[PDB]
């Protein structure tokens, strides 16, 4: 179906402890493929998926060049923002930036994004039309006007609609066996006695890709949303994901409960019951 490429950048000032930390990561869908860490030894963009490793030296030199430029930009931006908000020189602050593109099932442009945050909240973002900006506060209205007059939207729009989508297409085909796979969850239920009169039913989904999944419990076909223990979807470490959902059941009531699993990889949604 749909696919995405996203870059995520984090810059953290360290007053009286040297240069700000800068970390950049790239993803296609739920798979990381590159990284840069200002505190690492290489000072280069580095591969994090096997399928990007076969890009040649011109790729890696070019990506290293651009990410150091991103790094320098952000170094400068931390100072600008400290002034804007009249903050002391001594405190650690955070800038985050995210951009990339979505393609549809036709692998043609679907949506573009470019978002910017300061200390954990919205600062400025490119709107959906990729032609205008949303400034979160009064400081960001200054940036909005600066960026309008320098035509920053125009430059990003050409990237997000053109080159971003072209590279996404190339990564998808070069990493076909990683990126164009769907791994259906392996599912099962566990039963454990909380006491003589109560037991936990835990419904498991394991080793699935992509991360998008829905796990729910019903009792006699009624939603148990407010009485289900649901964990956040979590990485297994091997590029697959995990999720579980548990309910507490009065003993004797096991057959009343059903766990329901929806995932891209299942031909049909599953309904699991204990005995």
């Amino acid at each position: 179906g749909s696919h995405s490429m996203r870059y995520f950048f984090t810059s953290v000032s360290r007053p009286g402890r040297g240069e700000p930390r800068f970390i950049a990561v790239g993803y296609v869908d739920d798979t990381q493929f590159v990284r840069f860490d200002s505190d690492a030894a290489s000072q280069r963009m580095e591969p994090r998926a096997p399928w990007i490793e076969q890009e040649g030296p011109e790729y890696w030199d070019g990506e290293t060049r651009k990410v150091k430029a991103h790094s320098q930009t952000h170094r400068v931006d931390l100072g600008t923002l400290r002034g804007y908000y009249n903050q002391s020189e001594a405190g650690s602050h955070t800038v985050q930036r995210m951009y990339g593109c979505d393609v549809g099932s036709d692998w043609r442009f679907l949506r573009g994004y470019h978002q910017y945050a300061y200390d954990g909240k919205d600062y400025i973002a490119l709107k959906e039309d990729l032609r205008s900006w949303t400034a979160a506060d009064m400081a960001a209205q200054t940036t909005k006007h600066k960026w309008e007059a320098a035509h920053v939207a125009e430059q990003l729009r050409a990237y997000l609609e053109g080159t971003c989508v072209e590279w996404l297409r190339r990564y998808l085909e070069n990493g076909k066996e990683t990126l164009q796979r769907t791994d259906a969850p392996k599912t099962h239920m566990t039963h454990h006695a909380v006491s003589d009169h109560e037991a936990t039913l835990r419904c498991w989904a394991l080793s699935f890709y992509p991360a998008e999944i829905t796990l729910t419990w019903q009792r006699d076909g009624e939603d148990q949303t407010q009485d289900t223990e649901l964990v956040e979807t979590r990485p297994a470490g091997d590029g697959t994901f995990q999720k579980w959902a548990a309910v507490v059941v009065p003993s004797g009531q096991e057959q009343r409960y059903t766990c329901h699993v929806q995932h891209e990889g299942l031909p049909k949604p599953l309904t699991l019951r204990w005995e």
Binding site: K66, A69, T73, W147
Partner: peptide
């Protein structure tokens, strides 16, 4: 591939 022309706030 990264954007080639990332601009400062100022």
């Amino acid at each position: 591939s990264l954007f080639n022309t990332v601009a400062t706030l100022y």
